[PDB]
C-alpha cells in the first residue's frame, strides 16, 4: 500500500497546486467579484480593499490572518465565531499533543522489529505486506514491551490536553454569547414565546380567545397579541411557494389563487389547533415566560424561547407531544438501521482497499488479473472516492429525518443532524475500516493456525494498516476540498455560465450570485469525522496527527477567507452549537480511550488497567461541565432582556415579522 | 436448608401472633392513647371513635380498609398518599404477575428432574443438598428445555404488567399533586426564592443592597425584602440549640450569651456571603422567578423554588458551586468504597448461611463439629439477623453523606439518601447473596471437574438455593417488623417508663409522646430492597412472589393504621417522591431483565435473545416517561400561583417565618 499512499498524496498535491494557482488568477479579475468577493458587495463595502494595485499575490492570507475576532463577529455573526473557535481548539489540541507524542513515539516505533519477527513466521505467498507501517505503534512494537509505557503515558498527554482546551473553550464561547446578546437590537424574537401544545378550546370558545385569556390571566399586563393560524395550512405553504414561482416566471393565476384560498379556509374551518406565538410586551416578561413550565403534567402548554422568524419551521409547529414521541422513536430506529447498511458499504470500501490481500483469500483468482499499474490506482483513488460518495448522501437524509421529528427551529434541527451524523460516522467509519482491514489480513492467517499467542499480534498488525489507509483519506480530503473551496471553481463555472446563457434579468444574476451559509450541517459533521479518526489513531499510529494538524489548520486559513469574503450567514443562534460540539469532542476522547485500552492490551501490556482511570475521568468531566455551562447556552437571561431599550420597541412591526408569508 | 426455612418462618409466625395479640390488648387501655392513637390527640379529634364499647377487636382493620384516599390526604398529607400509592402499585404488579406466573411455573418446575439427574453425578459426601428447591425454575429444569419457553414468556408478563402499573401511577400521583397544590393556603413558601450562589458586592456596597438592586431591577414591582444573614452563623446555630437545652433544663447563661453574640458578629463582620431568600410580593412573580435562569454562565445567581421554612437546611445554604461539585464527586467515591466493604460483609452472611457446604470448603474440620441442633438455629436466625444489622447502619450514614453534598431541602436530601441506598442495596445484596451461594456450593465441585457442559448447570443450582435464603429473609422481616410496628411495643415501653420514672413536667410527657414521621428514609429505601429481591427472583424462583405479596400487602394494612392514627407528617413535598420511586421500580425491572437473560442462557436456551428486545423497551419507557411527567413534579405552575388569594397575603408574617431562630 505504500506505493498507493505515495500516489494519492502526490496526486492531491498536484490538484491543490493547480486549483490554488487558479484562485490567485481568477480572483484578480474584477468581473469575478460576484463569486470570489461577495459579502462585501451585498453589504456594500466595496468588492475588495481600495482597488489600487492587484493585491500582492498573498493578500487573502494577510486579511484572514489579521482579521479580528470581533471583526468576524460584527461582519458575519456569533456563529461563525463559534465555528472558528471549534477549528482553533481542535487545532491546538492536535498541535501540542503532536509535538510531544510525535517526537517521542516516532523515534520509539522504528527502533524495534516486531514486524520483522512477525515476518519470520509470514509463511509463503504473503511476503510484501508492510513498509512505512514500521513507524507507528504498530505491528513493530514487541508484545511485552517496556516501550509501550510511552504509548500509555501518551494517552494521558492527549487526554489532559483535551481537557484543558475544552474547558478554556466553553468559557470563551460563553463570553462571546453573552457579549453579543447584551449588544444587539430590538429583534422580532426577543418578544415572543411559541406555545406548541395547547389544549382544545372549551365549549364554543374561539381558539384565539382561549389562548388569549389563559395567558392574559397569568400575565395581566403583558400579552399583546397571538398569531395562531397554522399559517394558512402547509398546503398553502406550497401554494405560496408556487405563487413565488409564478412571479419569478413573470420576471394558471386565477384558478391557482382559488385553490389556495379554498384549501386554506376549509382546513381552518374547524380548528387551527395548537401553535401560537404569543407576542409579549416588554422583553423581561417574554424572557421569564420562556423559561417557565406553564403547566404541570407536561403535555399541555409547552412554551419555548421562540425561534427568530427566519427559522420558525412553521411546518412542524403543530404536532402534539404524543406524536412527537412516536416520531422520535421511529426516527432513531431508522438511523440505527441506516448505520447497519452503511457498515455493509464501508466493509466494501476497506475490501477494495487491500488489493493484494484480497485475492489471496476472498476471490482467489477471480481478480488476480490485478497487475501492478491498475493495482496502484484502484487502491489510491477508488477506495477513498467511495467513502466520500457514501458519506455525502448522509447529511441530507439526516436533516430530513431530524426535521421530521418535530423540532421547531432550523438551528436545533441542524444540530440534530450533526448528532446523528456523529453517531453514524464514529461507529461506521472507524469500526468498519479498522476491523475489516484487520479481518481481511488476519483471516487467512487466523484460518490456518489457531491458538492465541500469535492471533492478537496479527490483529494489531492489521489495525495499524487500516491506519495508513485513513491517513491517505484525510489527506485527500483536505487537499482537494480546500482547493475547491478557495477556488470556488464549481460555483464560478455555474455563475459565469448562467450570466452568459441563462440570465434574463439583472435580478436573475443577483439571485445566482447569492453565496449561502457556511453550511453548518456538512461542515461540522464532516470535520467531526476527521476529529475522530485523528483522535483514535493518534497513538495507535502517530502520523495521523501530522496530517491532522494540516486539515484543521488549513481550516482557519481557508475558511476565514471564506467567511469574511463570501458566505453571508443565514440564521443566528448566538453560539448555541458549542454545547453540541463539546460533547462530541469529548466523546472522541472517550472512544480513543476505549480503543487505547483495547489495543494496549492486545499487545500484552498487563498494566493496561491504568487507562481505566481515564475512562472514568472523561465521564466525570462531562457532567461537571454540563452543569456549569450548558445552562447559559439555553436561555436568554433576564439581565439581557432588561437592558435599555432607547427607542420604544415598536410592536405590531414585531407582530408583522412572524406573519407567515 | 429446608429444615431452617421451616424454623425461621415458623418462629416468625410465633412472634407475629404474640406481638399482634399484645396490640389488641394494650390499645384498648385508654391510658395508652398517647402511643397507640396520637395524631388524633395532637390534632384534637378524640383518641379514637366515640368511646362507646371497646371497639370490636378487629377495628383497626375496618378503619384502615375504609379510610378514604382523600381522608389520608387531608389528615396527614400529600406525601403519605404517595407512599400509599407506592405500596399499592407494587402490590398490584406482584398480585397479577403472581397469579399467572405462579400457577403456570410452579406446576412446571416440579414436573421435571434436573436436580435428580444432577444428583446422578453428585459424587459422595455431598448428598443431601436440595429439597423444596425442586419447585422453582431451579436446578430442576433440564438444560435444553422446551419448558423454559414458559419461563421466558413469563419475563414478558411481569414486564408488561410493570409498565401498565407504573404509567397508571405517574398519572395518578400527578393528579394528586396538582389537586393538592390548587387547594392550599397562603404558606410561607409560595412567596420566596432562595438565591444561593451570589457574586460578591462591588466597591463598598453592602451585601444586602447588592442583592436588593439586582432583583429590584429585573422585577421592579416585586422584590419586597431579602433575608441573607447566614443565620447568625452555624456556630450560633449550635449556641441556640444550647440555649434551647438550657430552657429545657429550666423547665452558664450570661457567658454563653456572650459567646453567641461575639462569634456571630465576628463572622458577619466581613460578609454574610451568599444565600438569601428574596421574598417576592405576589405568588406568580415568585413562581416565575423560580423556574428562570437568572444568569448565563451558570455559576452565579442560582435560584431555586425555596423550601418551606421547616426544611431549609440553613447549614448548607452557602457553598459556592465549585465546592458543591467537589463535594458531589468525593461523596460518590465514598459511596462506592462503602459498596465494596459491604460486599465483604454480605459474602460473610451467605457463608454463614450454607453451613453444610461450608465445612467441605473454607474450614473443613474447623467447624465440622456442627451437629444438627446448633446447625438449624445458626442458619435460621443468625444469617438473617446479620443482614438486618448491616443494612440498618446504612440509612443514617447515607443521609449524613447526602446532606453534606450541599442539597438545600431535607426532602431532596432524603431522596438522595434513598437513591444511594438503592444502589448499595441492589448491588450488594443481590449480587452478593446470589453469587456467593453459587460460588460456595459450586466451588468445591467446580475445582475438581472441568469441561463446561456441567459447570453452568451447577451454577444455576446454586442461584436457586440463594433464592430460598432470600425468601426466608423477606418473611422474617415482614412478620417481625410489622408486628413491632403495630404494637409499637418498643415505643410503649419507652413512654410508660418515662412517664413513671423520668418525667418531671406535663410538657415532658408531651415531648415524649410526640410520634414522628413515616421516616421516608428508612421505609422506602428498605422496601426497595424487598422490591428488587422479589423482582429478580420472581421467575428464577417463583415463590418469592407469594412471600412478596404479603410484605407489601400487609403494608397497606399496617401502615395505614400507622398514618391515620400515629405518625404526624413533618414536611410536605406535595408528592415529589414519585419520580424517584418510579425510576427505581423501573430499574428493578431492568436488573431482573438482565438476570433473566443471563440465567435463561446458562440453562442453555439458545433463543434467549428474545429478552434483549425487552431490555431495550425498559430503557425507552424510561425516557418517554420522564419527558411526559417529570416536568410537573418539579415546579409550582403559574396557574397555581394565580389562584384567588381572598385574604391579602400578609407579608412580613411570611418574612418572619423564614427568620432563622
PDB file of C-alpha atoms in Angstrom, chain A residues 104-344:
ATOM      1  CA  UNK A 104       8.796  10.599  21.318  1.00  0.00           C
ATOM      2  CA  UNK A 105       6.710   7.850  19.790  1.00  0.00           C
ATOM      3  CA  UNK A 106       8.047   8.061  16.268  1.00  0.00           C
ATOM      4  CA  UNK A 107      11.543   7.690  17.376  1.00  0.00           C
ATOM      5  CA  UNK A 108      10.302   4.793  19.576  1.00  0.00           C
ATOM      6  CA  UNK A 109       8.379   2.886  16.874  1.00  0.00           C
ATOM      7  CA  UNK A 110      11.176   2.244  14.392  1.00  0.00           C
ATOM      8  CA  UNK A 111      13.667   1.230  16.997  1.00  0.00           C
ATOM      9  CA  UNK A 112      12.052  -2.183  17.279  1.00  0.00           C
ATOM     10  CA  UNK A 113      11.217  -5.026  14.915  1.00  0.00           C
ATOM     11  CA  UNK A 114       8.068  -6.886  15.767  1.00  0.00           C
ATOM     12  CA  UNK A 115       7.180  -6.599  12.094  1.00  0.00           C
ATOM     13  CA  UNK A 116      10.408  -8.393  11.188  1.00  0.00           C
ATOM     14  CA  UNK A 117       9.786 -11.059  13.841  1.00  0.00           C
ATOM     15  CA  UNK A 118       6.264 -11.477  12.601  1.00  0.00           C
ATOM     16  CA  UNK A 119       7.901 -11.726   9.198  1.00  0.00           C
ATOM     17  CA  UNK A 120       9.898 -14.677  10.462  1.00  0.00           C
ATOM     18  CA  UNK A 121       6.597 -16.512  10.513  1.00  0.00           C
ATOM     19  CA  UNK A 122       4.869 -14.994   7.443  1.00  0.00           C
ATOM     20  CA  UNK A 123       4.626 -18.372   5.716  1.00  0.00           C
ATOM     21  CA  UNK A 124       4.776 -18.010   1.941  1.00  0.00           C
ATOM     22  CA  UNK A 125       2.930 -16.025  -0.791  1.00  0.00           C
ATOM     23  CA  UNK A 126       2.157 -13.376   1.832  1.00  0.00           C
ATOM     24  CA  UNK A 127       5.550 -11.681   1.789  1.00  0.00           C
ATOM     25  CA  UNK A 128       5.398  -7.979   0.978  1.00  0.00           C
ATOM     26  CA  UNK A 129       2.766  -6.666   3.379  1.00  0.00           C
ATOM     27  CA  UNK A 130       4.087  -3.655   5.273  1.00  0.00           C
ATOM     28  CA  UNK A 131       6.667  -0.829   4.723  1.00  0.00           C
ATOM     29  CA  UNK A 132       6.323   2.601   6.393  1.00  0.00           C
ATOM     30  CA  UNK A 133       3.966   0.824   8.771  1.00  0.00           C
ATOM     31  CA  UNK A 134       7.139   0.389  10.797  1.00  0.00           C
ATOM     32  CA  UNK A 135       6.737   3.917  12.051  1.00  0.00           C
ATOM     33  CA  UNK A 136       3.566   3.805  14.123  1.00  0.00           C
ATOM     34  CA  UNK A 137       2.939   1.748  17.391  1.00  0.00           C
ATOM     35  CA  UNK A 138       2.003  -0.897  15.031  1.00  0.00           C
ATOM     36  CA  UNK A 139       2.976  -4.332  14.332  1.00  0.00           C
ATOM     37  CA  UNK A 140       6.520  -3.084  15.065  1.00  0.00           C
ATOM     38  CA  UNK A 141       6.309  -2.904  18.843  1.00  0.00           C
ATOM     39  CA  UNK A 142       7.128  -6.197  20.562  1.00  0.00           C
ATOM     40  CA  UNK A 143       4.303  -7.529  22.746  1.00  0.00           C
ATOM     41  CA  UNK A 144       5.588  -7.444  26.280  1.00  0.00           C
ATOM     42  CA  UNK A 145       7.157  -4.139  25.552  1.00  0.00           C
ATOM     43  CA  UNK A 146       8.939  -1.927  28.073  1.00  0.00           C
ATOM     44  CA  UNK A 147       8.475   0.644  25.349  1.00  0.00           C
ATOM     45  CA  UNK A 148       4.698   0.556  25.434  1.00  0.00           C
ATOM     46  CA  UNK A 149       4.913   2.521  28.646  1.00  0.00           C
ATOM     47  CA  UNK A 150       5.485   5.538  26.494  1.00  0.00           C
ATOM     48  CA  UNK A 151       2.424   4.706  24.431  1.00  0.00           C
ATOM     49  CA  UNK A 152       0.278   4.777  27.540  1.00  0.00           C
ATOM     50  CA  UNK A 153       1.690   7.902  29.054  1.00  0.00           C
ATOM     51  CA  UNK A 154       0.847   9.345  25.702  1.00  0.00           C
ATOM     52  CA  UNK A 155      -2.827   8.595  26.211  1.00  0.00           C
ATOM     53  CA  UNK A 156      -2.536  10.765  29.242  1.00  0.00           C
ATOM     54  CA  UNK A 157      -0.895  13.652  27.369  1.00  0.00           C
ATOM     55  CA  UNK A 158      -3.573  13.737  24.697  1.00  0.00           C
ATOM     56  CA  UNK A 159      -6.330  13.365  27.279  1.00  0.00           C
ATOM     57  CA  UNK A 160      -5.114  16.028  29.674  1.00  0.00           C
ATOM     58  CA  UNK A 161      -4.611  18.443  26.823  1.00  0.00           C
ATOM     59  CA  UNK A 162      -8.136  17.741  25.538  1.00  0.00           C
ATOM     60  CA  UNK A 163      -9.491  18.735  28.910  1.00  0.00           C
ATOM     61  CA  UNK A 164      -7.600  21.981  29.236  1.00  0.00           C
ATOM     62  CA  UNK A 165      -8.667  23.068  25.817  1.00  0.00           C
ATOM     63  CA  UNK A 166     -12.334  22.100  26.057  1.00  0.00           C
ATOM     64  CA  UNK A 167     -12.737  23.947  29.355  1.00  0.00           C
ATOM     65  CA  UNK A 168     -10.921  27.033  28.176  1.00  0.00           C
ATOM     66  CA  UNK A 169     -13.187  26.968  25.155  1.00  0.00           C
ATOM     67  CA  UNK A 170     -16.574  26.630  26.841  1.00  0.00           C
ATOM     68  CA  UNK A 171     -15.699  29.676  28.847  1.00  0.00           C
ATOM     69  CA  UNK A 172     -14.623  31.654  25.796  1.00  0.00           C
ATOM     70  CA  UNK A 173     -17.679  30.776  23.744  1.00  0.00           C
ATOM     71  CA  UNK A 174     -19.903  31.738  26.651  1.00  0.00           C
ATOM     72  CA  UNK A 175     -18.248  35.088  26.905  1.00  0.00           C
ATOM     73  CA  UNK A 176     -18.899  35.605  23.235  1.00  0.00           C
ATOM     74  CA  UNK A 177     -22.549  34.606  23.508  1.00  0.00           C
ATOM     75  CA  UNK A 178     -23.302  36.990  26.310  1.00  0.00           C
ATOM     76  CA  UNK A 179     -21.336  39.888  24.927  1.00  0.00           C
ATOM     77  CA  UNK A 180     -23.233  39.545  21.720  1.00  0.00           C
ATOM     78  CA  UNK A 181     -26.571  39.182  23.439  1.00  0.00           C
ATOM     79  CA  UNK A 182     -26.008  42.317  25.509  1.00  0.00           C
ATOM     80  CA  UNK A 183     -25.165  44.221  22.363  1.00  0.00           C
ATOM     81  CA  UNK A 184     -27.949  43.622  19.901  1.00  0.00           C
ATOM     82  CA  UNK A 185     -31.131  45.446  18.933  1.00  0.00           C
ATOM     83  CA  UNK A 186     -34.904  45.167  19.038  1.00  0.00           C
ATOM     84  CA  UNK A 187     -35.182  41.939  17.028  1.00  0.00           C
ATOM     85  CA  UNK A 188     -38.516  40.272  16.410  1.00  0.00           C
ATOM     86  CA  UNK A 189     -37.531  37.267  18.502  1.00  0.00           C
ATOM     87  CA  UNK A 190     -36.896  38.883  21.846  1.00  0.00           C
ATOM     88  CA  UNK A 191     -40.614  39.415  22.353  1.00  0.00           C
ATOM     89  CA  UNK A 192     -42.268  36.081  21.615  1.00  0.00           C
ATOM     90  CA  UNK A 193     -42.947  32.664  23.096  1.00  0.00           C
ATOM     91  CA  UNK A 194     -44.163  29.768  20.824  1.00  0.00           C
ATOM     92  CA  UNK A 195     -46.733  27.731  22.690  1.00  0.00           C
ATOM     93  CA  UNK A 196     -46.975  24.463  20.821  1.00  0.00           C
ATOM     94  CA  UNK A 197     -49.151  22.012  22.642  1.00  0.00           C
ATOM     95  CA  UNK A 198     -52.320  23.851  23.562  1.00  0.00           C
ATOM     96  CA  UNK A 199     -55.414  22.072  24.801  1.00  0.00           C
ATOM     97  CA  UNK A 200     -58.652  22.402  22.909  1.00  0.00           C
ATOM     98  CA  UNK A 201     -60.987  25.359  23.203  1.00  0.00           C
ATOM     99  CA  UNK A 202     -63.734  24.769  25.776  1.00  0.00           C
ATOM    100  CA  UNK A 203     -67.455  24.996  24.998  1.00  0.00           C
ATOM    101  CA  UNK A 204     -67.815  27.160  21.918  1.00  0.00           C
ATOM    102  CA  UNK A 205     -64.868  29.421  22.606  1.00  0.00           C
ATOM    103  CA  UNK A 206     -62.737  30.547  19.697  1.00  0.00           C
ATOM    104  CA  UNK A 207     -59.218  29.168  19.657  1.00  0.00           C
ATOM    105  CA  UNK A 208     -57.807  32.673  19.758  1.00  0.00           C
ATOM    106  CA  UNK A 209     -59.793  33.774  22.787  1.00  0.00           C
ATOM    107  CA  UNK A 210     -58.916  30.595  24.635  1.00  0.00           C
ATOM    108  CA  UNK A 211     -55.194  31.301  24.354  1.00  0.00           C
ATOM    109  CA  UNK A 212     -55.939  34.921  24.882  1.00  0.00           C
ATOM    110  CA  UNK A 213     -57.452  34.591  28.321  1.00  0.00           C
ATOM    111  CA  UNK A 214     -55.069  31.929  29.574  1.00  0.00           C
ATOM    112  CA  UNK A 215     -52.005  33.994  29.073  1.00  0.00           C
ATOM    113  CA  UNK A 216     -53.770  37.244  29.882  1.00  0.00           C
ATOM    114  CA  UNK A 217     -54.523  35.894  33.320  1.00  0.00           C
ATOM    115  CA  UNK A 218     -51.111  34.700  34.385  1.00  0.00           C
ATOM    116  CA  UNK A 219     -49.631  37.865  32.992  1.00  0.00           C
ATOM    117  CA  UNK A 220     -52.307  40.508  33.098  1.00  0.00           C
ATOM    118  CA  UNK A 221     -50.217  43.342  31.761  1.00  0.00           C
ATOM    119  CA  UNK A 222     -48.145  41.599  29.136  1.00  0.00           C
ATOM    120  CA  UNK A 223     -49.924  39.570  26.456  1.00  0.00           C
ATOM    121  CA  UNK A 224     -50.348  41.873  23.441  1.00  0.00           C
ATOM    122  CA  UNK A 225     -51.323  39.531  20.621  1.00  0.00           C
ATOM    123  CA  UNK A 226     -51.263  35.944  19.449  1.00  0.00           C
ATOM    124  CA  UNK A 227     -50.515  34.555  15.994  1.00  0.00           C
ATOM    125  CA  UNK A 228     -52.061  31.088  15.685  1.00  0.00           C
ATOM    126  CA  UNK A 229     -53.470  30.361  12.210  1.00  0.00           C
ATOM    127  CA  UNK A 230     -51.435  27.225  11.364  1.00  0.00           C
ATOM    128  CA  UNK A 231     -50.022  29.536   8.665  1.00  0.00           C
ATOM    129  CA  UNK A 232     -52.995  29.105   6.297  1.00  0.00           C
ATOM    130  CA  UNK A 233     -52.075  25.360   6.273  1.00  0.00           C
ATOM    131  CA  UNK A 234     -48.912  23.799   4.687  1.00  0.00           C
ATOM    132  CA  UNK A 235     -50.831  23.130   1.535  1.00  0.00           C
ATOM    133  CA  UNK A 236     -50.910  26.918   1.303  1.00  0.00           C
ATOM    134  CA  UNK A 237     -47.298  26.928   2.213  1.00  0.00           C
ATOM    135  CA  UNK A 238     -46.899  25.002  -1.060  1.00  0.00           C
ATOM    136  CA  UNK A 239     -49.333  27.237  -2.979  1.00  0.00           C
ATOM    137  CA  UNK A 240     -47.493  30.417  -1.963  1.00  0.00           C
ATOM    138  CA  UNK A 241     -44.266  28.783  -2.928  1.00  0.00           C
ATOM    139  CA  UNK A 242     -45.933  28.260  -6.308  1.00  0.00           C
ATOM    140  CA  UNK A 243     -47.095  31.879  -6.441  1.00  0.00           C
ATOM    141  CA  UNK A 244     -43.495  32.841  -5.876  1.00  0.00           C
ATOM    142  CA  UNK A 245     -42.574  30.557  -8.736  1.00  0.00           C
ATOM    143  CA  UNK A 246     -45.148  32.359 -10.881  1.00  0.00           C
ATOM    144  CA  UNK A 247     -43.858  35.826 -10.073  1.00  0.00           C
ATOM    145  CA  UNK A 248     -40.337  34.612 -10.832  1.00  0.00           C
ATOM    146  CA  UNK A 249     -41.542  33.350 -14.200  1.00  0.00           C
ATOM    147  CA  UNK A 250     -43.127  36.760 -14.719  1.00  0.00           C
ATOM    148  CA  UNK A 251     -39.818  38.485 -14.002  1.00  0.00           C
ATOM    149  CA  UNK A 252     -52.885  29.430 -14.013  1.00  0.00           C
ATOM    150  CA  UNK A 253     -53.146  32.592 -11.879  1.00  0.00           C
ATOM    151  CA  UNK A 254     -56.856  32.769 -11.067  1.00  0.00           C
ATOM    152  CA  UNK A 255     -57.553  29.058 -10.620  1.00  0.00           C
ATOM    153  CA  UNK A 256     -54.422  28.717  -8.535  1.00  0.00           C
ATOM    154  CA  UNK A 257     -55.491  31.536  -6.182  1.00  0.00           C
ATOM    155  CA  UNK A 258     -58.854  29.817  -5.964  1.00  0.00           C
ATOM    156  CA  UNK A 259     -57.188  26.574  -4.931  1.00  0.00           C
ATOM    157  CA  UNK A 260     -55.113  28.328  -2.289  1.00  0.00           C
ATOM    158  CA  UNK A 261     -57.924  30.251  -0.661  1.00  0.00           C
ATOM    159  CA  UNK A 262     -60.293  27.291  -0.693  1.00  0.00           C
ATOM    160  CA  UNK A 263     -57.941  24.741   0.849  1.00  0.00           C
ATOM    161  CA  UNK A 264     -56.715  27.172   3.485  1.00  0.00           C
ATOM    162  CA  UNK A 265     -60.206  28.185   4.580  1.00  0.00           C
ATOM    163  CA  UNK A 266     -61.541  24.616   4.561  1.00  0.00           C
ATOM    164  CA  UNK A 267     -58.718  23.461   6.815  1.00  0.00           C
ATOM    165  CA  UNK A 268     -59.029  26.364   9.265  1.00  0.00           C
ATOM    166  CA  UNK A 269     -62.809  25.788   9.229  1.00  0.00           C
ATOM    167  CA  UNK A 270     -62.620  23.561  12.278  1.00  0.00           C
ATOM    168  CA  UNK A 271     -59.581  24.375  14.359  1.00  0.00           C
ATOM    169  CA  UNK A 272     -56.204  25.987  13.781  1.00  0.00           C
ATOM    170  CA  UNK A 273     -55.111  23.594  16.504  1.00  0.00           C
ATOM    171  CA  UNK A 274     -52.049  24.396  18.517  1.00  0.00           C
ATOM    172  CA  UNK A 275     -49.017  26.606  17.972  1.00  0.00           C
ATOM    173  CA  UNK A 276     -49.225  30.284  18.542  1.00  0.00           C
ATOM    174  CA  UNK A 277     -46.522  32.809  19.049  1.00  0.00           C
ATOM    175  CA  UNK A 278     -47.915  34.897  21.895  1.00  0.00           C
ATOM    176  CA  UNK A 279     -46.148  38.196  21.494  1.00  0.00           C
ATOM    177  CA  UNK A 280     -45.470  39.839  24.809  1.00  0.00           C
ATOM    178  CA  UNK A 281     -44.930  43.478  25.519  1.00  0.00           C
ATOM    179  CA  UNK A 282     -41.616  44.080  27.288  1.00  0.00           C
ATOM    180  CA  UNK A 283     -38.715  41.730  26.898  1.00  0.00           C
ATOM    181  CA  UNK A 284     -38.269  40.652  30.504  1.00  0.00           C
ATOM    182  CA  UNK A 285     -41.753  39.284  30.502  1.00  0.00           C
ATOM    183  CA  UNK A 286     -41.189  37.305  27.356  1.00  0.00           C
ATOM    184  CA  UNK A 287     -37.910  36.021  28.747  1.00  0.00           C
ATOM    185  CA  UNK A 288     -39.475  34.929  32.006  1.00  0.00           C
ATOM    186  CA  UNK A 289     -42.287  33.260  30.204  1.00  0.00           C
ATOM    187  CA  UNK A 290     -39.836  31.338  28.138  1.00  0.00           C
ATOM    188  CA  UNK A 291     -38.016  29.536  30.860  1.00  0.00           C
ATOM    189  CA  UNK A 292     -41.156  28.647  32.826  1.00  0.00           C
ATOM    190  CA  UNK A 293     -43.232  25.491  32.947  1.00  0.00           C
ATOM    191  CA  UNK A 294     -46.663  26.906  32.305  1.00  0.00           C
ATOM    192  CA  UNK A 295     -48.439  23.677  33.293  1.00  0.00           C
ATOM    193  CA  UNK A 296     -47.693  20.616  35.368  1.00  0.00           C
ATOM    194  CA  UNK A 297     -48.324  17.203  33.847  1.00  0.00           C
ATOM    195  CA  UNK A 298     -46.094  18.156  30.937  1.00  0.00           C
ATOM    196  CA  UNK A 299     -48.356  17.575  27.953  1.00  0.00           C
ATOM    197  CA  UNK A 300     -50.082  20.902  27.733  1.00  0.00           C
ATOM    198  CA  UNK A 301     -48.827  24.432  27.074  1.00  0.00           C
ATOM    199  CA  UNK A 302     -45.188  23.842  26.170  1.00  0.00           C
ATOM    200  CA  UNK A 303     -43.504  27.218  25.956  1.00  0.00           C
ATOM    201  CA  UNK A 304     -40.140  27.561  24.280  1.00  0.00           C
ATOM    202  CA  UNK A 305     -37.982  30.576  23.585  1.00  0.00           C
ATOM    203  CA  UNK A 306     -39.423  31.310  20.158  1.00  0.00           C
ATOM    204  CA  UNK A 307     -37.093  30.989  17.186  1.00  0.00           C
ATOM    205  CA  UNK A 308     -36.335  34.031  15.014  1.00  0.00           C
ATOM    206  CA  UNK A 309     -38.761  34.403  12.150  1.00  0.00           C
ATOM    207  CA  UNK A 310     -36.316  33.022   9.624  1.00  0.00           C
ATOM    208  CA  UNK A 311     -36.176  29.645  11.314  1.00  0.00           C
ATOM    209  CA  UNK A 312     -39.533  29.002  12.858  1.00  0.00           C
ATOM    210  CA  UNK A 313     -40.177  25.846  10.840  1.00  0.00           C
ATOM    211  CA  UNK A 314     -43.869  26.617  10.747  1.00  0.00           C
ATOM    212  CA  UNK A 315     -44.442  23.226   9.165  1.00  0.00           C
ATOM    213  CA  UNK A 316     -43.855  21.133  12.254  1.00  0.00           C
ATOM    214  CA  UNK A 317     -45.122  23.645  14.770  1.00  0.00           C
ATOM    215  CA  UNK A 318     -48.250  21.677  15.359  1.00  0.00           C
ATOM    216  CA  UNK A 319     -47.637  18.070  16.444  1.00  0.00           C
ATOM    217  CA  UNK A 320     -48.989  17.263  19.932  1.00  0.00           C
ATOM    218  CA  UNK A 321     -46.309  15.642  22.148  1.00  0.00           C
ATOM    219  CA  UNK A 322     -47.818  12.141  21.704  1.00  0.00           C
ATOM    220  CA  UNK A 323     -46.977  12.193  18.056  1.00  0.00           C
ATOM    221  CA  UNK A 324     -43.656  13.851  18.768  1.00  0.00           C
ATOM    222  CA  UNK A 325     -42.517  10.944  20.929  1.00  0.00           C
ATOM    223  CA  UNK A 326     -43.720   8.358  18.402  1.00  0.00           C
ATOM    224  CA  UNK A 327     -41.711  10.181  15.761  1.00  0.00           C
ATOM    225  CA  UNK A 328     -38.608  10.368  17.924  1.00  0.00           C
ATOM    226  CA  UNK A 329     -38.653   6.628  18.447  1.00  0.00           C
ATOM    227  CA  UNK A 330     -39.199   5.719  14.826  1.00  0.00           C
ATOM    228  CA  UNK A 331     -36.511   8.145  13.619  1.00  0.00           C
ATOM    229  CA  UNK A 332     -33.933   6.745  15.997  1.00  0.00           C
ATOM    230  CA  UNK A 333     -34.714   3.179  14.912  1.00  0.00           C
ATOM    231  CA  UNK A 334     -34.280   4.208  11.300  1.00  0.00           C
ATOM    232  CA  UNK A 335     -30.932   5.828  11.966  1.00  0.00           C
ATOM    233  CA  UNK A 336     -29.811   2.550  13.534  1.00  0.00           C
ATOM    234  CA  UNK A 337     -30.833   0.508  10.501  1.00  0.00           C
ATOM    235  CA  UNK A 338     -29.008   3.009   8.306  1.00  0.00           C
ATOM    236  CA  UNK A 339     -25.874   2.555  10.455  1.00  0.00           C
ATOM    237  CA  UNK A 340     -26.083  -1.176   9.674  1.00  0.00           C
ATOM    238  CA  UNK A 341     -26.427  -0.724   5.883  1.00  0.00           C
ATOM    239  CA  UNK A 342     -23.576   1.711   5.892  1.00  0.00           C
ATOM    240  CA  UNK A 343     -21.451  -0.875   7.756  1.00  0.00           C
ATOM    241  CA  UNK A 344     -22.127  -3.011   4.685  1.00  0.00           C
TER     242      UNK A 344
END
